[PDB]
Design a protein around this ligand. Structure first.
Ligand SMILES: COC(=O)Nc1ccc(NC(=O)[C@@H]2c3ccccc3CCN2C(=O)/C=C/c2c(-n3cnnn3)ccc(Cl)c2F)cc1
Length: 238
């Protein structure tokens, strides 16, 4: 996160840190708890990931220093990547992780609500991007979970900012015209959470952008409301 501040413990209880153990253990991507065995993240996180056996999901973490060999995590049973996904810049940048065990809900770890189909017309005024990513393009994974409040940008304005790309309605952009506050390397897959009628909704999945927090280069997120039926298909299968 560029231009962010340290979060408080339990502020984003749906935020997870997805680690890979190959070749050594390290933070790979952010993610969100959406169900007791379901993590919603970005499909691009799994480039070259051959098996779910190298993945570890950590919930209820404020600081990366909380994670040692003895720290409990959730194993990943299945990686489900959207069938139409090719690359982040083309859309469909969405994946589900089916966990090997159930997440026990509490004040440190709980699910974020998916946006409603009726909430497609609603205007979100209080949106936040969170993660352990870089603070500048050449930086490092941060110890403490950072947060930044960012305004949502219309599809029309976002398309003006990205000539040469096709910004579809399955994408949602966010950022200040002048830049300064945005997601950066290591934040991808994490949430873009918006508070509406005192309830937090998973509005976007941190996906891509040209650089980090650049003037007139908003962050591009998977527009979660457009994938609600896909999420239900995968998580509510008979
Ligand atoms: C040695 O340890 C490390 O350096 N760890 C470390 C650990 C993890 C990442 N993740 C990434 O780079 C991941 C990642 C993960 C898997 C496969 C590929 C990629 C590439 C994209 N990506 C981002 O985080 C997305 C950046 C991003 C962004 N940036 C543009 N350029 N940089 N940021 C601007 C706006 C928005 Cl919305 C973004 F979402 C990097 C370094």
């Amino acid at each position: 996160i560029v231009g962010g501040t340290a979060s408080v413990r339990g502020e984003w209880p749906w935020q997870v840190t997805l680690h890979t153990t190959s070749p050594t253990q390290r933070h790979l991507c952010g993610g969100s708890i959406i169900g007791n065995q379901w993590i919603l993240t970005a499909a691009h996180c799994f480039y070259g990931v051959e098996s779910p056996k190298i993945l570890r999901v950590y919930s209820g973490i404020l600081n990366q220093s909380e994670i040692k060999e003895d720290t409990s995590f959730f194993g990943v049973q299945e990686i489900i990547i959207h069938d139409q996904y090719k690359m982040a810049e083309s859309g469909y940048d969405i994946a589900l992780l089916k966990l090997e065990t159930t997440v026990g809900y509490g004040d440190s770890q709980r699910p974020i609500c998916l946006p409603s189909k009726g909430d497609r017309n609603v205007i979100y005024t209080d949106c936040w991007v969170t993660g352990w990513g870089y603070r500048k393009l050449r930086d490092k994974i941060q110890n403490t979970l950072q947060k930044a409040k960012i305004p949502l940008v219309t599809n029309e304005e976002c398309q003006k900012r990205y000539r040469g790309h096709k910004i579809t309605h399955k994408m949602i952009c966010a950022g200040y015209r002048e830049g300064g506050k945005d997601a950066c390397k290591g934040d991808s897959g994490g949430p873009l959470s918006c508070k509406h009628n005192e309830v937090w909704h998973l509005v976007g999945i941190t996906s891509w952008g040209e650089g980090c927090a650049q003037r007139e280069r908003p962050g591009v997120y998977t527009n979660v409301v457009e994938y609600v039926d896909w999420i239900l298909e995968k998580t509510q299968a008979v």
